[PDB]
Amino acid sequence: IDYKFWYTQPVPKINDEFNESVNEPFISDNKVEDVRKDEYKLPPGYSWYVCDVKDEKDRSEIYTLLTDNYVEDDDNIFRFNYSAEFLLWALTSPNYLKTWHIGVKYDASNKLIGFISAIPTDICIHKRTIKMAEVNFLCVHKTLRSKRLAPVLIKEITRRINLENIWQAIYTAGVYLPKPVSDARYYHRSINVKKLIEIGFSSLNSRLTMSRAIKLYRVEDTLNIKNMRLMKKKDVEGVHKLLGSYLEQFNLYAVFTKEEIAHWFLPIENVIYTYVNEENGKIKDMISFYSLPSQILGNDKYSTLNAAYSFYNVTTTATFKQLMQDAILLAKRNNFDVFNALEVMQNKSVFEDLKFGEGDGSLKYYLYNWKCASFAPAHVGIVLL
Ligand SMILES: CCCCCCCCCCCCCC(=O)CSCCNC(=O)CCNC(=O)[C@H](O)C(C)(C)COP(=O)(O)OP(=O)(O)OC[C@H]1O[C@@H](n2cnc3c(N)ncnc32)[C@H](O)[C@@H]1OP(=O)(O)O
Ligand SMILES: CCOC(=O)c1cnc2ccc(OCc3ccc(N4CCNCC4)nc3)cc2c1SCCC#N
Ligand SMILES: [Cl-]
Ligand SMILES: [Mg+2]
């Protein structure tokens, strides 16, 4: 493929490979005073719209758009189904700009048909921390694909980001663009296998009967780390230390403030779960996973897949293996059907012993306007929504 849009932009060409020692922007010495002050032109009968995520009604309009039009797997079994409460948590982190939540409406009908979002975060690439935008939730309605709207959405958000004197961005995708800094396979751990078979995702055979399948994915309902409990406000400082120390070994990761810690980890029902082990008034271990349901497309009996996604996990009092077994138990106790993770951080090493299956695709990590060595997913220490 040609990448007629992406080749205009400050990213790598497909054939670009840089040494471990090159770690700089593609275009340095940018200035806010030169950024375009006009909005990008939309085609006839479309308008830019500014979304207020904190208003139930606008938030529901985005929710409606994502429900019907977001990413489907290759085999169209599933469609991501971010909840309304989820979008509120993901779009209102500390210092979020309301102007970085960009909608597009069809004038004749007043209906949202397009969306792109960004929030600010500090990012450490190969030991240099940089102010960045994190881009998420790009979506064009199904009736309007392959009409070159995506680039308008990207250029527009780029423009508004540049106005805040920010010139770098991090994003993830299932698709291949120029060019990933890392590529990680996902892995699934069955919890309610009976459902995973009935919808057609998982398969039986003459060796693995229905009952043998259930027997194999059974977990013991007793935690290895006895005192593991839900995070509370008094745990923010201890979470900040533990996680700030652990993350420093990776090639790519976000630098968290106390404020971001409380925002990203304080538990919220059906959104984000965090557990901690506290001895001596000190936080020595933590487990976290987020809820991302999927719509199960065209199925008589089931409409929703309840899925937990591995977030950040750190142990100092047990093995990583034991910690994640406790994560899987904690997922099961909250009615999740499946536990998903990427081969990032220490995760790869436990997939075989804990009975994870290799999934069908992979998640690519990209930076905008950053030149650097690509690296294996073990060196990736950030998880994005
Ligand atoms: C300094 C600040 C920097 C800020 C900016 C940073 C960049 C952030 C970038 C955003 C990161 C998103 C992160 C994120 O949200 C997480 S990845 C999930 C994105 N969402 C979906 O997949 C939802 C369902 N699909 C859609 O809505 C459409 O397929 C979309 C709208 C994706 C494309 O609409 P369309 O109707 O299918 O296509 P056209 O309008 O005709 O446009 C075709 C052009 O779109 C390029 N394309 C396709 N998919 C892309 C993707 N996932 N990322 C980036 N680019 C993508 C494609 O390569 C082609 O360019 P080319 O001709 O060069 O090949
Ligand atoms: C039973 C186990 O399977 C699942 O839980 C599930 C649910 N909904 C999806 C919806 C779309 C999909 O397409 C491939 C894909 C496409 C993009 C993507 N991203 C992009 C950026 N944001 C989140 C992850 N992740 C996966 C796969 C899926 C999958 S499996 C593949 C990846 C995951 N999780
Ligand atoms: Cl227990
Ligand atoms: Mg289009």
Residue numbers in the entry: 26 to 410
Please share text taken word for word from the publication where this structure appeared:
In particular, NMT has been validated as a pharmacological target in fungal infections, in a range of parasitic diseases caused by Trypanosoma,7Leishmania8 and Plasmodium protozoa and filarial nematodes, and as a potential target for the treatment of cancer.
As expected, an ionic interaction is observed between the piperazine and the C-terminal leucine. The pyridine ring also establishes a stabilizing polar interaction with the phenol of Tyr211. The benzyloxy-present in all the above compounds sits at the top of a narrow cavity, which leads to the catalytic C-terminal leucine of N-myristoyltransferase. Virtually all of the known families of NMT inhibitors interact with the C-terminal residue, which is a leucine in fungi, Plasmodium and Leishmania but is a valine in T. brucei and a glutamine in human NMTs. This interaction is usually formed by an amino group in the inhibitor that establishes a strong ionic bond with the C-terminal NMT carboxylate.
